[PDB]
């Protein structure tokens, strides 16, 4: 059971091994659009933090789940920032989220004073005031209940049928090493100009045994003028200098 679009769910991914190639080639998704990265380079990146937003919308409102869009879902239900990094996955779910006579468990907001911020969530249920007259907790002329309900019936045209949407969002803030595609931690070497990758840190140089006491909580070493000059090996947890 997914959540409604006006109060959407947000699952946060933790340290893992993620395989996005089995998602990109599942042949069951109606829309797989990545925005901040090419899809084929998904298996090799280490996103400090991954979030997943899951909800249910209509069929002709999937094109509003994109950075910089207009419409009632785009204005105030779910807003995507213009500098997006994750992907949008969307698939038809008429067999699951619809039933005969109408499935009214999926409400959406169609009245709000202002547009939403990106990643803003408005679960308020105040009575909207369309006109200049206040009504103070009752309906009437130009006083509306802000949440309508989707009428989901399986005898609907395609474009009025329930589409399940999952929006993945990746970010690379300051973490030391989080989730990441499946890779083989090939044996490390020393004292040779090498091409290395330390759970995200990509570089080149000679690796050497260190003697700098990396405080139990310091992922790496920063040098004035800001160039990486030390790392910590994730598996054995020892500090190594990176000479060029």
């Amino acid at each position, epitope marked *: 059971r997914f959540a409604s679009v006006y109060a959407w769910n947000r699952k946060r991914i933790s340290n893992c091994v993620a395989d996005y190639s089995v998602l990109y080639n599942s*042949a*069951s998704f109606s829309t797989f659009k990545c925005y901040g990265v090419s899809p084929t380079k998904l298996n090799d990146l280490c996103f400090t933090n991954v979030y997943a937003d899951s909800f249910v919308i209509r069929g002709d409102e999937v094109r509003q789940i994109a950075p910089g869009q207009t419409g009632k879902i785009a204005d105030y239900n779910y807003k995507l920032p213009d500098d997006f990094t994750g992907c949008v996955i969307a*698939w*038809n*779910s*008429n*067999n*699951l989220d619809s*039933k*005969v006579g109408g499935n009214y468990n999926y409400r959406y907001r169609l009245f709000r004073k202002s547009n939403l911020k990106p990643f803003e969530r408005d679960i308020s249920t105040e009575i909207y005031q369309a006109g200049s007259k206040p009504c103070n907790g009752v309906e009437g002329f130009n006083c509306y209940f802000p949440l309508q309900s989707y009428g989901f019936q*399986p*005898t*609907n*045209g*395609v*474009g009025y*049928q329930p589409y399940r949407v999952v929006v993945l969002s990746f970010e690379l803030l300051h973490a030391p090493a989080t989730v990441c595609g499946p890779k083989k931690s090939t044996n490390l070497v020393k004292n040779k100009c090498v091409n290395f990758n330390f759970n995200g840190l990509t570089g080149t140089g000679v690796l050497t045994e260190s003697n700098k006491k990396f405080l139990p909580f310091q992922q790496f070493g920063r040098d004035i003028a800001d160039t990486t000059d030390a790392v910590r090996d994730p598996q054995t947890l020892e500090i190594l200098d990176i000479t060029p």
Partner: antibody
Amino acid sequence: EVQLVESGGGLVQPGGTLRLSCVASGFSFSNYWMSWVRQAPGKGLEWVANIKQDGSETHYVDSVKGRFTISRDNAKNSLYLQMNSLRADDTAVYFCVKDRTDWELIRGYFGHWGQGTQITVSS
Amino acid sequence: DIVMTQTPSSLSLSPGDRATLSCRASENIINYLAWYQQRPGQSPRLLIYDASNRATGIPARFSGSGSGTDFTLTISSLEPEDFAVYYCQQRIIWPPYTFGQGTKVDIK
């Protein structure tokens, strides 16, 4: 291999009552959305009903409702369809149909039909 | 509710050539169409499910595709068992699940 044996069809009067049974062996009963599909003699195929891997949303064809009833039994690996007040136009060949897949999103495809039984309604 | 239509009714052919069959919907379905082969005196058999995807145990002579209103099944070389009736069926708009009408391919 998957086998879908079925029985119960025959000859009855307009206004009679029949009950078709259907036994499944090859796959693993339950989880599969079993169905029933008729075909008139000398015409194309049609559709009758389908239920669940349980009992829910029996889902008839709206030219039949109130006269047919589809049910199942997972312990006996059996599927039943009962017809009352036969309207002298439900003379056809009826087929037990499996549903080609295991999970609900890709259901709806009539994978692995069975051989059909014949029902004639006359006097 | 959806009136599926098979635009040729019968194709006279010779064993060995190709065979094209067209199914046209009355409403925009997308990718959700299957093709069944009613053999003479046998139970029907699912050839392709989901438009261009073949089912298990089906040889590579059968191909399909589409994504809207027009759909087409193609048989590369007619084996002598392939002279049968062919039905197209949608599954996105139910109840009811509507079939086509049949395209009896025979020998000539």
